[PDB]
Write a protein that binds this ligand. Structure first.
Ligand SMILES: [Mg+2]
Ligand SMILES: [Mg+2]
Ligand SMILES: [Mg+2]
Ligand SMILES: [Mg+2]
Ligand SMILES: [Mg+2]
Ligand SMILES: [Mg+2]
Ligand SMILES: [Mg+2]
Ligand SMILES: [Mg+2]
Ligand SMILES: [Mg+2]
Ligand SMILES: [Mg+2]
Ligand SMILES: [Mg+2]
Ligand SMILES: [Mg+2]
Ligand SMILES: [Mg+2]
Ligand SMILES: [Mg+2]
Ligand SMILES: [Mg+2]
Ligand SMILES: [Mg+2]
Ligand SMILES: [Mg+2]
Ligand SMILES: [Mg+2]
Ligand SMILES: [Mg+2]
Ligand SMILES: [Mg+2]
Ligand SMILES: [Mg+2]
Ligand SMILES: [Mg+2]
Ligand SMILES: [Mg+2]
Ligand SMILES: [Mg+2]
Ligand SMILES: [Mg+2]
Ligand SMILES: [Mg+2]
Ligand SMILES: [Mg+2]
Ligand SMILES: [Mg+2]
Length: 117
RNA sequence: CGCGAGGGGAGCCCUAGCACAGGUGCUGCAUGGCCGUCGUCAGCUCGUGCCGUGAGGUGUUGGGUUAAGUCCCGCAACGAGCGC
């Protein structure tokens, strides 16, 4: 059921701003706009979710991100819809690499929670 | 130490020798301290992270505002320290 539903409203986008690398996943080009190979997506979808489901049962925590507005809140709801960590709230420098100093901002939010109740 | 003779010790004083004092003599280019100054100027940096072979850069820049690096929004940065 995954297939046609993608063709539902989830393929083809952009034009003349692509990247030759991505070209292998491309199918054609109508109206000047690029048409993505729907059938090939399906394959990558399988391999991906294999890892997704795997790391899920492994109990891993996935970090979701998308500051882009056209996916702003969609990242939000789906996040609590799994308890999985995430940030579409505009990314930051050292989110992961400087996770130490960043997490201190959290420990400060905890303290604010302390006076918030 | 004795009844007293007399002698002797502390102290202080002078005379004597020695140890040593004393110096507003030099060096602020050997120094502490304190003070003047740019300046009551908004400025000067640290930790971590990222960029760079490196000196270093980023933050501290940008837009708004203030007496002000004041605050705000923004931002590969997140905070913090001596400063207002
Ligand atoms: Mg803080
Ligand atoms: Mg006698
Ligand atoms: Mg006698
Ligand atoms: Mg006698
Ligand atoms: Mg006697
Ligand atoms: Mg007698
Ligand atoms: Mg007598
Ligand atoms: Mg006599
Ligand atoms: Mg006599
Ligand atoms: Mg005598
Ligand atoms: Mg005696
Ligand atoms: Mg005399
Ligand atoms: Mg004399
Ligand atoms: Mg002299
Ligand atoms: Mg001096
Ligand atoms: Mg002032
Ligand atoms: Mg530090
Ligand atoms: Mg450092
Ligand atoms: Mg350096
Ligand atoms: Mg900062
Ligand atoms: Mg500076
Ligand atoms: Mg600088
Ligand atoms: Mg900048
Ligand atoms: Mg600023
Ligand atoms: Mg300013
Ligand atoms: Mg930001
Ligand atoms: Mg900033
Ligand atoms: Mg301040």
């Amino acid at each position: 059921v995954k297939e046609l539903l993608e063709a539902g409203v989830h393929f083809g986008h952009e034009r003349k701003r692509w990247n030759p690398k991505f070209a292998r996943y491309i199918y054609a080009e109508r109206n000047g706009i690029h048409i993505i190979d729907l059938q090939k997506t399906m394959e990558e979808l399988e391999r991906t979710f294999r890892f997704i489901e795997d790391l899920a049962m492994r109990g891993g925590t996935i970090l979701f991100v998308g500051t882009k507005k056209q996916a702003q809140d969609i990242v939000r709801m789906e996040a609590e819809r799994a308890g999985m960590p995430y940030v579409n709230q505009r990314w930051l420098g050292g989110m992961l690499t400087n996770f130490k100093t960043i997490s201190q901002r959290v420990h400060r939010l905890e303290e604010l929670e302390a006076l918030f109740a």
